[PDB]
Design a protein around this ligand. Structure first.
Ligand code: HEM
Length: 149
């Protein structure tokens, strides 16, 4: 467990340094594999539909925002700090404001696993994959629990 905790933090350290490219790749992977998920993101849907040249920059911008939230929550959890405030307002905005089902959130987490296996093939081994999958399963269950309130 303590090994997995260190693997998660070290992995997110490397993701943080390349968050714009990785975040854009995660959003691209999610939207291509799940057009039903892209439909629930109106701004990205219209930029995709119209072949807008601004799409790449906005994918990098928002992809960094998504990864920054995951990185911060992981650092708070595995350091014994209070992450409840971030989990609640992230779940509030996505259930009430953005109206995003939990399954679409899983598509993002599944895309992050697939992107990291491609971007870090010699570091993202079985230990790193199992540790990140455990955190992502934990993150989804926490948001899902806040949904059921
Ligand atoms: C692990 C999954 C996800 C994470 C960590 C995440 C994180 C975030 C964060 C930190 C923000 C900015 C602050 C906020 O609005 O709360 C945001 C905004 C937003 N999210 Fe996500 N999100 C996830 C999944 C999704 C998915 C799958 C969709 C839609 C298909 C979505 C739709 C949106 C929208 C529409 C916004 C507003 C962006 C804007 O107004 O510029 N989220 N998300």
């Amino acid at each position: 467990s303590e090994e997995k905790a260190a693997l998660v933090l070290a992995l997110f350290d490397r993701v943080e340094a390349d968050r714009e490219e990785i975040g854009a790749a995660v959003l691209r992977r999610t939207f291509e594999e799940h057009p039903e998920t892209l439909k629930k993101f109106p701004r990205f849907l219209e930029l995709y539909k119209k072949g807008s040249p601004e799409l790449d920059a906005l994918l990098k911008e928002h992809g960094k925002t998504v990864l920054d939230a995951l990185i911060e929550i992981a650092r708070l959890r595995y350091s014994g700090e209070d992450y409840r405030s971030l989990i609640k307002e992230l779940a509030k905005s996505h259930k009430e404001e953005h109206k995003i089902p939990i399954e679409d959130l899983r598509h993002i987490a599944e895309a992050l696993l697939a992107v990291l296996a491609e971007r870090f093939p010699d570091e993202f081994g079985p230990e790193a994959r199992a540790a990140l999958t455990d955190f992502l399963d934990w993150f989804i269950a926490e948001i899902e629990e806040e949904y059921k309130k």
